[PDB]
Amino acid sequence: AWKVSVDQDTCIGCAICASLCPDVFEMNDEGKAQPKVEVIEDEELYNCAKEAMEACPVSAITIEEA
Numbered sequence: 001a002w003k004v005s006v007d008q009d010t011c012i013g014c015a016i017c018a019s020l021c022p023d024v025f026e027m028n029d030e031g032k033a034q035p036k037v038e039v040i041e042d043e044e045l046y047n048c049a050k051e052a053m054e055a056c057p058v059s060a061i062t063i064e065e066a
């Protein structure tokens, strides 16, 4: 399984990740992104999250596997 994280101090709230992968990322009350799910097992969701991670203009996204 995978766990996605968005570094709140780094995120600039550009919403690219939410646009690309709305099942995985949402905007919060600070105007930053955060994961809308605490675990991913669905390969489609992981693949999307991986593309968002690669696209983030400020490198705020990381994905942990276990």
Ligand code: SF4
Pocket: 006, 010, 011, 012, 013, 014, 015, 016, 017, 018, 032, 033, 052, 055, 056, 057, 058, 059, 060, 061
């Ligand atoms: S793509 Fe990166 S900087 Fe933009 S909202 Fe998502 S985590 Fe934040």
